[PDB]
């Protein structure tokens, strides 16, 4: 039982949020059904806080945290796996993250970027010079979902911190434990209380509030098309940074060595399995040439075998579950109708609940839901494409999505076609497209994206106003 | 009598805009009474086609325009001050604007601001780079107003025309000439005519294209909060840069001399009535210090009776008219709606029609219309703050608006102090609010615009999205 935090206060409603554990659908926690009055409370104390916190000050907060993440790792993943059902394995990873991204952002306190521009430069230039500084906004809205309920959080929470922004968050009622802890955690590492609040409730009462409260100057939001669409409409007259889905894409090339094409299933098994297979880049498409398919098909299929599916609070699981059954289900659904339609599954030791194995299947067509459609699950799913660069590309870029890819390859003429053609944006190179560092430019296009970037760097940028000053010169 | 230009095609309708000089009230020209399916044609245009010119070409087309607006810049001022109806002084300056902008855009297209990351950073660090690189989008809609009928769509078209965009603009239809005269020129000049259309129309019929067409990925407009607010509701899942307004002051500070009161009466008069004070920048407030100002005013007023207003199309003119009679009529209204309420109107020779002379009124009550909300004329309204920066700065920031300022001071403590504290986008000190070079960063905050920059350098960033790409290192 874990009551809101806001601004440093616990904050309780009578109602409740229960939230299970999709292992076994117990009750592991509950937070309060909050309403748009708390949400509404949030942002007023927001609004009039001011921080003042010198870099130096951001700085020690933030590597603080990281040190507090790292020291309570275990416990942190506890509730990470608790509530969102993702292995031990997975859910240390993610403490992982969060630990970079604070100690990137804290990091990144030291940097000004400020510019300088000389205006004798035209006919109607003058003896001035002009300079640039950032102040932050009067309060910023996060909402967050379930299937990084420390990192999004992280992610959207350290770069207000480093601007001097003061930011509410309303992570997914699946999964607000974890936001709730990090609050408690960066209020120990002497964050001033006003610059964090963590709301909790269902979208229908208090959803609404972080969307349009008038204090509110960014939404910065992380989840589904239909959600980020609907957010998108009623945010009128704010900065929005959306980042919807993902349907990315492995791309295998037809002139990979036999060596080279088992590297590949390296990085298609991982990919498509890490964290459950529920990433915004997860690989849901494993787009392999016809003529190497045969040999790629059985690596791939090989790998998948060797990982162990179970108990997620076990430390030698390496796939946990899915968000919950109902998730699980449709997704076995995706693959039976694709089989139907042709394709071949290879492995598929059968569903148990929440608990998907990493089914492998092949031959599966382009058009078929299961790969034109969003998948966010372990599926390893090979669609056999032709050997030509022309229509792999054309079938690469034909769904609604357009956020990150992997190419494995050798040849440097074939590298630049793809990252030149491929409608995303993110290109890795032999790397899966969940491949990222947590300060590189992050974000897509099409319906993954409304086209801002991400990741600490931009983050920050994102989270200011850009204010110029002139003086005589 | 002048067409649409749909891609390089004339396109008309049998419906007319008649296009009124607001000097006599005249008919000076028509443009088609355009509607939804001329904008819809025209995105698809730019949607279809997919520019391939090198920076050199584009370098080429953006210097050859700049060369051919000041070889014709008689004739264009002449189209401006017809339609708009300020002086051929004014009208000549906005062409020199445009030559800068065309001039500016075309030598940043050598730059190329992509960024290298190193990859090896931490525990989870590859030894990788990430490379960044910008693509244009799918098509531009672009809206723009009255004031700078010349300028304004300038800043829109050159950074697309630099980043290999393709943009279709409707200009208001109280200035389209001008702007279809420019996408003669670009076309001269070289410029595959896919990449330009302009249409003209109605806002009723053809406006709701140009926000909500599908092929739009980014809607740029300037012009009023309530038009820019209808923008921001209706152009959904867009990227939108929108200024609109501003309300800004010159502030005058009681440590200058009365040599630097007499400099600063200049800066005054100039920025109140350049452009007939048709400047979203304009100076509208002028908060002078009570200590000052019975030295100040006097030096206003002497300067204000200097200005020549009258016949827009006599060279010796300083102050033509502003858009139409109406906003002349409303502008009056508010001063003396300002002196019943304790101004002191100090100089007023008498409205005649459209034309507004430079009226100059002290002792403004700051919560008079004439001040409180913008008024978008000529007027050079001194309001009286205490000697108490504290004070002075709470009352510049107390409207609704947040663009540019201007700060006349000797004393470094006291700018650095306005510099902070001034809640806009610009402050600059002893000059006007509505100095800028062409290519400095540019935009407000509160309701003077979304919170996105403009100028050349910020534009053509926005108008495109970064990919990165990451390869084995
Ligand atoms: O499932 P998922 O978390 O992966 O993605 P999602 O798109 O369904 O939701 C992600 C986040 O948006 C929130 N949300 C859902 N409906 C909302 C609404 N009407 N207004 C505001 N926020 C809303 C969720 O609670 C969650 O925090
Ligand atoms: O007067 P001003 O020029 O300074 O600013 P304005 O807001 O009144 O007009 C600026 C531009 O917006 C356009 N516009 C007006 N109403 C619109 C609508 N309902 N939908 C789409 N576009 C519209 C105008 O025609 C003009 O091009
Ligand atoms: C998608 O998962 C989310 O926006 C961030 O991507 P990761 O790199 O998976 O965090
Ligand atoms: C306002 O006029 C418009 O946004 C641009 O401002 P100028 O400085 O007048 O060009």
Same mark, same amino acid.
């Given at each position: 039982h874990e009551p809101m935090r806001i601004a440093g206060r616990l904050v309780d409603t009578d109602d409740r949020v229960e939230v299970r554990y999709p292992w076994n659908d117990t009750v592991v926690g509950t937070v309060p059904a909050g309403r748009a009055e708390h949400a509404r409370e949030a942002f007023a104390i927001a609004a009039a806080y001011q921080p003042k916190l010198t870099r130096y000050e951001r700085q020690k907060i933030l590597l603080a945290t990281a040190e507090a993440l790292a020291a309570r790792k275990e416990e942190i993943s506890d509730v990470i796996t608790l509530e969102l059902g993702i292995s031990k394995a997975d859910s240390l990873y993610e403490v992982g993250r969060a630990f970079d991204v604070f100690t990137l952002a804290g990091? #990144?306190?030291? *940097?000004?970027?400020? =510019?300088?521009? %000389?205006?004798?430069?035209?006919?109607?230039?003058?003896? *001035?010079?002009?300079?640039? #500084? *950032? =102040? @932050?906004?009067?309060?910023? %809205?996060?909402?967050? @979902?379930?299937?990084? @309920?420390?990192? #999004?959080?992280?992610?959207?929470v350290a770069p207000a911190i480093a601007t001097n922004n003061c930011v509410v968050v309303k992570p997914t009622e699946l999964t607000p434990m974890t936001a709730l802890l990090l609050a408690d955690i960066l209020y120990e590492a002497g964050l001033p209380p006003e610059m964090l609040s963590v709301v909790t409730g269902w979208p229908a009462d208090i959803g609404m509030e972080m969307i349009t409260n008038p204090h509110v100057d960014l939404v910065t939001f992380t989840g589904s098309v239909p959600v980020g669409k609907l957010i998108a409409a009623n945010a009128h007259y704010k900065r929005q940074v959306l980042e919807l889905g993902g349907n990315d894409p492995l791309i295998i090339l037809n002139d990979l060595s036999d060596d080279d094409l088992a590297r590949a299933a390296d990085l298609a098994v991982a990919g498509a399995t890490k964290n459950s297979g529920q990433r915004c880049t997860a690989v849901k498409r494993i787009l392999c040439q016809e003529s190497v398919a045969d040999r790629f098909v059985p690596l791939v299929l090989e790998r998948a075998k060797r990982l162990r599916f179970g108990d997620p609070m076990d430390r030698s699981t390496d796939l946990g579950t899915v968000i919950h059954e109902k998730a699980a289900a449709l997704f076995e659904e995706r693959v039976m109708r694709a089989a139907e339609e042709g394709a071949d599954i290879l492995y598929h030791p059968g569903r148990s609940g929440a608990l998907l194995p990493p089914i492998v299947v092949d031959r599966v067509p382009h058009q078929s839901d299961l790969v034109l459609e969003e998948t966010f699950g372990p599926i390893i799913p090979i669609v056999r494409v032709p050997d030509d660069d022309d229509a792999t590309i054309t079938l690469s870029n034909s769904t609604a999505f357009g956020l990150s890819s992997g190419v494995c390859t050798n040849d440097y003429r074939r590298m630049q076609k793809y990252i030149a053609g491929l409608k995303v944006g993110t290109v890795n190179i032999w790397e899966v497209p969940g491949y990222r560092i947590e300060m590189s430019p992050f974000g897509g296009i099409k319906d993954s994206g409304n086209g801002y970037k991400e990741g600490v760097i931009e983050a920050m940028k994102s989270f200011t106003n850009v204010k110029t000053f002139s003086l005589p010169w």
């Open positions: 990091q #990144m306190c030291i *940097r000004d970027d400020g =510019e300088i521009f %000389s205006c004798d430069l035209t006919p109607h230039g003058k003896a *001035r010079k002009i300079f640039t #500084m *950032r =102040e @932050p906004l009067t309060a910023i %809205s996060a909402i967050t @979902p379930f299937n990084h @309920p420390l990192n #999004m959080v992280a992610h959207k």
